[PDB]
Amino acid sequence: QACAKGCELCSEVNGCLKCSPKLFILLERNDIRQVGVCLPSCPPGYFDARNPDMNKCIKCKIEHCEACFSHNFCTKCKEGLYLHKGRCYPACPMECS
Ligand SMILES: [Cl-]
């Protein structure tokens, strides 16, 4: 008992579905069935979404994006860039040096 270590909610087929709140679920949609792992931190280019119940790694390979709510779609760009449909756009508010 009870699931892969660190896993709270566990499926015989898809593996972990909800990690304990310490950890971050990574859901690698690997061909073809989906499999979850529980990680202490997310892999490169994943944003780590924290929530009171749970944490999750969300793919966020968006240049100059600070956060993604859902897979590769930015919900907050770095200061001075403009966010439009999940992407980040310069310019660039005194002057722009
Ligand atoms: Cl990163």
Ligand SMILES: [Cl-]
């Ligand atoms: Cl923004």
